[PDB]
Design an enzyme around this catalytic site. Structure first.
Site, PDB file in Angstrom:
ATOM      1  N   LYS A 110       0.828  -1.189   0.000  1.00 23.69           N
ATOM      2  CA  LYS A 110       0.000   0.000   0.000  1.00 23.69           C
ATOM      3  C   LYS A 110       0.865   1.243   0.000  1.00 23.69           C
ATOM      4  CE  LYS A 110      -3.898   2.028   2.567  1.00 23.69           C
ATOM      5  NZ  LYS A 110      -4.569   2.640   1.391  1.00 23.69           N
ATOM      6  N   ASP A 233     -12.428   4.762  12.127  1.00 19.68           N
ATOM      7  CA  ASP A 233     -12.698   4.871  10.685  1.00 19.68           C
ATOM      8  C   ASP A 233     -12.088   3.728   9.881  1.00 19.68           C
ATOM      9  OD1 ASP A 233     -14.317   7.028  11.038  1.00 19.68           O
ATOM     10  OD2 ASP A 233     -12.836   8.519  10.401  1.00 19.68           O
TER      11      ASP A 233
END
Ligand SMILES: Nc1ncnc2c1ncn2[C@@H]1O[C@H](COP(=O)(O)O)[C@@H](O)[C@H]1O
Ligand SMILES: Nc1ncnc2c1ncn2[C@@H]1O[C@H](COP(=O)(O)O)[C@@H](O)[C@H]1O
Ligand SMILES: Nc1ncnc2c1ncn2[C@@H]1O[C@H](COP(=O)(O)O)[C@@H](O)[C@H]1O
Ligand SMILES: Nc1ncnc2c1ncn2[C@@H]1O[C@H](COP(=O)(O)O)[C@@H](O)[C@H]1O
Lengths: 303, 320
Positions: A110, A233
């Protein structure tokens, strides 16, 4: 003979970089413990090649590895050998430069932000200490290494993690859970459905009591730990592999639980025959309340 | 498994750099031919390891390798495999900055000046060519790698070469020979050394003479003349024939004593490894092994053509 060959120079640098650092580490004794400095440490290597070995590699580049001792210990605690990690990144170019998987689908790569790397340093000590305390048994993202590449004067930050899905078993439908799916997105080969799309479809996940109980025993400890760190989140990536559709060799719903660490078979009494994948993603970038909603909304998908 | 442990950081960086570059080279296909750029090429890696891996290596250092595609090919033409080379340098610290031997005595590492590294580039295309057409059969220095190291901001240049001497056999007497109408001898200071570096009038004074027999004297003299003419064209001079002498019986006794102290082949060598070594004939007084090679072909009234013929006349008389 490894030609660090890949679509773009940045991927070649990454392959070069993981190869070089893992080798360098093979010459570093495994210590009896991590020390505070290991958490503020790095390797930096700068390369300037003139008229040499530029067939795949740029002639000039930089490669920086954060806290190599810590991430190598993480690799060990997650049950990953350094040579295999090296081979998975390095044997063949990663595939799809923002979100990649190694060619063998075991690891994910990532691209992240500067502040993300700052956030990782901020939590690395506690994250490690928790990985120790839970003996590597956790739904949390598994941080395998972290790097900064400098190519053409541009810095790029990357984090290597264990793929949540199988590296074999095809995924047939993915739910991101904490809200519904876009329109242009539902027209992809594999749409990323959300909480509502899940509850709408009235999807169900039946898995031997042990799987549920044991899965939640850990899901709780993890979320409780994310709250203890004031993080939120983050979603629960869920994969579904439907055995029949994909139906000397491998068998149906066959998998190696030591590799596909997140895989769960269906129940001896379940509608369709499925393999499920589940883990926590995106924890980098009320929250105590976030944990409890998350923890309950999830608990209500397992019978 | 390699710590790069050494008495001086410069040596650690040497071991690290040879190790690193040989591994990179292992992922670089072996080309059909060399190209002109290969003779202008280089690798440069700069390291900064903060709070990491600093037991033996410094945190910060630089390693540069000149023309590595070329030196790899040179190693191959000299019948040296890259893994062996890397291992000799890295398995354990080189011994003895400004002149080292690898721990196994296969290779030698000479600290050189930046003028030397320039001469290497100047002569590199011809030297390679010359190595190709004599098939690796030469008394010349056999250059295996060229490097620039940076430690504490200080630059050091190094050339790696093959040992003139045996890696096994012991040398009991040694000479540096150029041969000139001047004065060359061992100082009262040198002779005081264990292995003195005797010179020309010493060799003449003590009336020495090496007994190799005609088949070898001829093979040897054909090398020299060719080597020295090549140096001649390149306008080179001031180089010596390094001569080492192994006494077979003296070493056999030395070994025996080595055992007695501890407890409380026989003049045989692999001509493929000990590349400059020559047995003595069956009509030699003492039974011996010799080692002979040209050294010092880079900077540390006669001319270069004179030298080649003179240097060559002298060495010719040394054999029988
Ligand atoms: N050892 C460290 N401890 C804390 N923050 C760091 C550390 N290394 C890098 N960072 C932060 O991570 C981001 C990238 O830093 P750099 O490696 O200089 O690009 C910046 O926000 C840095 O302040
Ligand atoms: N750990 C993981 N393993 C496999 N795929 C992932 C993982 N994390 C994220 N992804 C996928 O990569 C894409 C980008 O992730 P995100 O930016 O977190 O949504 C998402 O659409 C996910 O489906
Ligand atoms: N490719 C080359 N051709 C000729 N001379 C060189 C070359 N590379 C370096 N040198 C010389 O070698 C010495 C040291 O080189 P360096 O410190 O590597 O730049 C200087 O005299 C340089 O001019
Ligand atoms: N290639 C070589 N093999 C073995 N010994 C050498 C070699 N070159 C030089 N020496 C010795 O190392 C020392 C330094 O040599 P030099 O720098 O030519 O004066 C002297 O004792 C030389 O005889």
């Amino acid at each position: 003979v490894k030609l660090f060959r890949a679509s773009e120079p940045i991927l070649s640098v990454l392959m070069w970089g993981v190869n070089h650092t893992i080798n360098e580490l093979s010459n570093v004794p495994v210590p009896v413990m991590l020390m505070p400095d290991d958490f503020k440490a790095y390797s930096k290597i700068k390369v300037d090649n003139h008229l040499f070995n530029k067939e795949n590699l740029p002639s000039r580049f930089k490669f920086k590895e954060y806290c190599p001792m810590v991430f190598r210990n993480l690799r060990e605690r997650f049950g990953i050998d350094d040579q295999d990690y090296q081979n998975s990144v390095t044997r063949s170019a990663p595939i799809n430069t923002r979100f990649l998987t190694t060619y063998d689908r075991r690891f994910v790569i990532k691209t992240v932000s500067s502040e993300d790397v700052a956030e990782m340093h901020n939590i690395l000590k506690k994250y490690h200490q928790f990985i120790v305390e839970c003996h590597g048994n956790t739904l949390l993202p598994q941080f395998l290494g972290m790097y900064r590449l400098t190519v053409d004067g541009v810095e790029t930050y990357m984090v290597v993690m264990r793929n949540v899905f199988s590296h074999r078993l095809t995924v047939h439908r993915k739910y991101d859970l904490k809200r519904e799916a876009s329109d242009k997105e539902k027209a992809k080969d594999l749409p990323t459905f959300k909480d509502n799309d899940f509850l709408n479809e009235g999807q169900k996940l039946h898995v031997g009591e042990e799987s549920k109980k044991n899965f939640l025993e850990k899901l709780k400890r993890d979320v409780e730990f994310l709250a203890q760190l004031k993080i939120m989140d983050y979603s629960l990536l869920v994969g579904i592999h439907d055995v029949d559709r994909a139906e000397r060799f491998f068998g149906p719903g066959e998998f190696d639980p030591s590799v596909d660490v997140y895989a769960m078979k269906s129940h001896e009494s379940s509608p369709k025959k499925e393999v499920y994948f589940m883990a926590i993603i995106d924890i980098l970038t009320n929250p105590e309340q976030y944990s409890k909603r998350f923890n309950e909304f999830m608990s209500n998908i397992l019978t």
